[PDB]
């Protein structure tokens, strides 16, 4: 029973931990400040009048 519980819980624990940590690490801010607006609002992208 101990070995069965190991073989059941250990991979589940590892998969859950890895999933949580990968979902956390992969989070990044969007490349644009406002979604749906192509303008970057950056000093190098001066929008001359």
């Amino acid at each position: 029973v101990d070995r069965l519980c190991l073989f059941v819980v250990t991979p589940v624990m590892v998969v859950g931990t890895a999933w949580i940590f990968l979902q956390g690490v992969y989070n990044q801010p969007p490349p644009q400040p406002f979604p749906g607006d192509p303008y970057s609002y950056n000093v190098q992208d001066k929008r001359f009048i």
Partner: protein, 163 residues
């Protein structure tokens, strides 16, 4: 402005000139002489917008505003070293319970100690974060999952000892 409205004052972004051509300064100004790098937050974007609400009355104060945005990203290395690593190690320590012999009489003790450590970490993180119900923090979800797994492992160990 609260003393004035769009009928009284028109807000606009600062215009700056390069090569005799003017352009609006649509971002937060950072001056390298006056700017101090914060130790936790990196400024990824810093836009500025003049917001006008078309449905708001022209004489209401809420019609216009200038909003400067700071999209700041947390530097996680401190939290990885000090929080994430001990919590993950303590969670994975529960997997060793299945390996300790039943004659040792310490499997339940190990499981309960792991549960207590997880509870202490959850208390610390819940103290470090606001009580917002919008979403469970990722580390909080991991802690809850680990606590559930530790409870199940304690039940399994108790059953094994009974057998």
């Amino acid at each position: 402005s609260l003393k004035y409205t769009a009928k009284e004052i028109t807000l606009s972004l600062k215009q700056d000139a390069k090569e005799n051509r003017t352009y609006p300064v649509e971002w937060i100004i950072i001056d390298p002489e006056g700017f101090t790098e914060n130790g936790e937050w990196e400024i990824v974007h810093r836009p500025a917008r003049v917001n006008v609400d078309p449905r708001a009355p022209l004489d209401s104060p809420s019609r216009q505003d200038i909003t400067f945005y700071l999209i700041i990203r947390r530097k996680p290395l401190f939290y990885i070293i000090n929080i994430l690593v001990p919590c993950v190690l303590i969670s994975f320590m529960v997997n060793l319970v299945f390996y300790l012999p039943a004659d040792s009489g310490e499997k339940t003790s190990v499981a309960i100690s792991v549960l207590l450590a997880q509870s202490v970490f959850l208390l610390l993180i819940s103290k470090r974060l606001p009580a917002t119900s919008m979403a469970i923090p990722l580390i909080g979800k991991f802690l809850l999952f680990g606590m559930v797994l530790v409870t199940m492992v304690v039940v399994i160990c108790v059953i094994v000892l009974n057998i």
